[PDB]
Amino acid sequence: MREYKLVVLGSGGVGKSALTVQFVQGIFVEKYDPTIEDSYRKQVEVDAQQCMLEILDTAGTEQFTAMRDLYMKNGQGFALVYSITAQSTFNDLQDLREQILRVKDTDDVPMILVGNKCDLEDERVVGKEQGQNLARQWNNCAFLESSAKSKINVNEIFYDLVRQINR
């Protein structure tokens, strides 16, 4: 069984922690503890392969630059999450991608572009075509639209991330 390090990046009001907890812990969290080792570990089958995924959530660490660089260095896949209700949260991902591309000297990095809070269609300000065009520019990487509350494309985030890692 192969082990995957998947790092979740994003701005403040994106709810990336919501996606992480929904993916690993599920809808019922009943007892929760984020200081224990296997709180971010989930065993998952993708493309007939059994994999152990570890999610590195940058919940309150994005202000500590050293920790951010070690996240980028240590991480195999990167999920850049934005909120479809805020344009600024979408624009903030370019600098994040550049920092990943600088920590890893190459340009080819396993990465998925995620538009979260997709169910709030009445508040949407960024079109799906924006994320499609950007992911196409970003070495034609994966692009998805998800909703942690509506349980849309939660597992597919890391499914497609693992696919990109194996690709």
């Binding site: 403040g12 984020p34 590195l56 050293a66 920092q99």
Partner: protein
């Protein structure tokens, strides 16, 4: 137990004391006295204690009176900084002191004193001030000849001197907002963290030839080793992660000139502070520590933010019953962060080198500027 309200829990904290003043279960009263701003402002809690004391006075219940006064005394002795900083809380304590002088007839009035607190509020408002036109390049020439341990020690002191200025209000505001919003003390601490990292980066990119840059890399690896020996995990992360910045990691030619022993020790230190396994190595080392320890703030901030976003504050939609688990879990972290201020680092430090270090850490370069400097040192 499970499903408590702020009124029931405050009453439980009152009942936890003895008529003599003995505290029976100090963990509960210490928990609620620190954690209550999460749910109710401190001035309002003081007003509730005031009302309980008055209502007990009307019924001549001496036990409830003296127990309430002992709770207020423990509150003042345990968290004096908040009593100096919060004017409304101090006004509530003033009113309660007046009630004690009237009805208690100075029998319990001596139990409450608000200016017995050796506190300096302006410590959090005071910012540094240093001369212009310093040209403080003497630190550049100096740190080459500086013993690693010594340097480590001084860095520790600096960071520790900032860490002690952080109160519970700052942690609360951070965890609530996810970031530092109108939080200058914690913002200053984080800025000093990143200043240490960027200082490592600048000190390394300052040398013009690759073996010299490799030499300063080895030096910073040794100061990180000494920081670990100092049981200062916070600054360790600052320099180790600073050694893994994009600007320095892409310096392949200087990275050829670092000895393999240095590489072994360096990768060991980087593995110590890895995020793999939810910082398991770091957590295990910190748990095994005895004596003074400096936890990496940011792992624990990550835990607090995770707890805040995942679990609800209240169990009912009316927002009156406290989620007992969350409050406990949060507490288990924050108390630890508090206990760090209980011990001082076993560090000798001459203030002259402190001043030099601060002036050097002050200089700020953007990420792009350091990357450009790296490109100058080694093009593609």
């Amino acid at each position: 137990d499970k499903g408590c309200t702020v009124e029931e829990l405050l009453r439980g904290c009152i009942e936890a004391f003895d008529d003599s003043g003995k505290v029976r279960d100090p963990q509960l009263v210490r928990m609620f006295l620190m954690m209550h701003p999460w749910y109710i402002p401190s001035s309002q809690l003081a007003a509730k204690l005031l009302h309980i004391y008055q209502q007990s006075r009307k019924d001549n219940s001496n036990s409830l009176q003296v127990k309430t006064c002992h709770l207020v005394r423990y509150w003042i002795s345990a968290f004096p900084a908040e009593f100096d900083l919060n004017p409304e809380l101090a006004e509530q304590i003033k009113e309660l002191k007046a009630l004690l002088d009237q009805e208690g007839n100075r029998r319990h009035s001596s139990l409450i004193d608000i200016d017995s607190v050796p506190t300096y509020k302006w410590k959090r408002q005071v910012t540094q001030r240093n001369p212009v036109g310093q040209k403080k390049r003497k630190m550049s020439l100096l740190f080459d000849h500086l013993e690693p341990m010594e340097l480590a020690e001084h860095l520790t002191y600096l960071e520790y001197r900032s860490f002690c200025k952080i109160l519970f209000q700052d942690y609360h505001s951070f965890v609530t907002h996810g970031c530092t919003v109108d939080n200058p003390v914690l913002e200053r601490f984080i800025s000093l963290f990143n200043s240490v990292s960027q200082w490592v980066q600048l000190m390394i990119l300052s040398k013009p030839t690759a073996p010299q840059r490799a030499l300063v890399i080895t030096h910073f690896v040794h100061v990180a080793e000494k920081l670990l020996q100092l049981q200062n995990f916070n600054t360790l992360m600052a320099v180790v992660g600073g050694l893994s910045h994009s600007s320095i990691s892409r310096l392949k030619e200087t990275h050829s000139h670092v000895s393999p022993e240095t590489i072994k020790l360096w990768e060991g230190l980087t593995e110590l502070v890895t995020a793999t396994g939810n910082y398991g190595n770091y957590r295990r080392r910190l748990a095994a520590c005895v004596g003074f320890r400096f936890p990496i703030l940011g792992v624990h901030l990550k835990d607090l933010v995770a707890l805040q976003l995942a679990l609800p504050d209240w169990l009912d939609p009316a927002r009156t019953r406290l989620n007992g688990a969350k409050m406990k879990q949060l507490f288990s972290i924050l108390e630890e962060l508090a206990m760090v201020t209980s011990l001082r680092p076993p560090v000798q430090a001459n203030p002259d080198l402190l001043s030099l270090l601060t002036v050097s850490l002050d200089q700020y370069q953007t990420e792009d500027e350091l990357y450009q400097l790296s490109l100058q040192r080694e093009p593609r």
